[PDB]
């Protein structure tokens with residue numbers, strides 16, 4: 001008997017969650033942008049220690 | 050009694066000091082490391098050293114003269130010091146070095162010996178001077194791919210590739226009358242200097258204007274030079290500051306005075322009226338720190354440098370400091386602003402009213418090159434006393450709050466967290 005209401009709530013729920021999922025990916029990429037594009041260089045230290 | 054400024058072709062600027070027992074005459078050029086490129090980087094530093102070369106210094110010493118030269122980012126200076134009476138002898142040497150001589154100082158043996166000398170010099174700085182090396186790297190990352198990113202001493206790579214021709218090219222392009230100011234400080238009169246200069250003739254590249262380029266730009270970034278074999282962690286951190294002649298020049302300097310400088314080993318330093326000190330002394334987060342407001346023609350840097358042996362609590366050091374900076378935008382008190390005013394005045398007074406003619410020469414030349422004149426302490430002090438809490442909050446909300454930062458560090462910096470954790474601390478959560 002909950003059939004009609006369940007499907008209606010399902011539409012609201014999937015839309016909100018799909019948006020949240022996509023939003024979270026973008027937010028994650030921004031917060032990680034500094035680490036992802038990070039660059040390293042190696043200059044062998046002078047033999048003395 | 051008010052600093053004279055006369056021009057007849059060559060702009061002459063003097064600052065007479067009756068209490069001075071010596072006199073300094075020299076020339077300041079409006080070109081420094083910021084006018085070089087990554088490949089001739091160090092050319093100015095090389096010039097400074099050939100001018101201070103033994104041959105040139107011996108000649109000056111025979112005349113009872115002392116040579117001084119300073120390579121900065123926006124400017125470059127060459128000063129000669131002597132007794133107030135031997136002021137004309139200084140001009141002759143100055144005239145000789147920048148008009149008569151050329152192939153004398155740029156000889157194969159002198160240039161190579163000088164080159165080898167600055168090479169070992171720069172190598173030692175990069176190898177041992179950690180706090181300054183870090184500050185140089187702060188500029189490098191903050192203004193990367195921009196004029197202001199080049200170190201004043203030059204880089205080893207470009208230095209070892211430099212030849213006499215490179216020096217000449219720079220000299221012909223920057224050591225020009227239109228890019229210079231002849232300064233006179235200590236015990237000397239303006240007329241005595243202007244007439245002695247106006248005594249000679251010639252021009253040596255007249256009307257020639259220096260080369261132009263692209264403006265400095267700040268970039269939120271970082272460079273980490275980790276070295277676990279060093280006993281401390283040395284860090285410099287800053288936001289984009291104020292350029293010289295900025296309307297907020299003093300507000301920024303006052304803001305930096307609020308947090309000031311500290312030396313954990315000095316008893317009185319630990320007693321300063323700085324709120325940050327209550328947070329960092331409990332677990333002794335650092336050995337020392339110093340806030341600054343570096344100003345240049347195109348831009349500036351506002352932040353601090355610190356050194357610490359407390360390698361496991363670096364995160365607290367940075368956190369507490371940046372939390373204090375947050376306060377400039379929302380809760381800085383009237384007494385903090387009033388304490389800063391008094392100490393800033395003292396700082397400027399000590400800087401401008403130093404008992405050193407060479408210092409006055411450098412400051413005078415640099416300022417007249419940028420704004421055509423030199424601001425007096427009387428006017429500076431008036432501007433400082435006019436600064437309000439609202440001015441500091443307005444400036445902080447613009448330059449500090451939720452703004453990008455530049456970071457540089459060397460030594461045991463494993464404990465210095467990622468960029469974003471540090472960057473997030475530039476603000477506080479609000480309802």
Ligand SMILES: CCCCCCCCCCCO[C@@H]1O[C@H](CO)[C@@H](O[C@H]2O[C@H](CO)[C@@H](O)[C@H](O)[C@H]2O)[C@H](O)[C@H]1O
Nearest residue numbers: 378450451452453471472473474475476477478479480
């Ligand atoms: C368990 C499920 C419940 C979920 C509820 C969701 C919680 C939402 C919280 C939303 C916002 O909380 C809010 O976050 C922003 C950052 O994004 C904070 O902003 C703070 O940092 C930002 C970013 O550096 C600054 O620009 C800003 O001036 C500063 O106040 C703001 O002060 C805070 O109030």
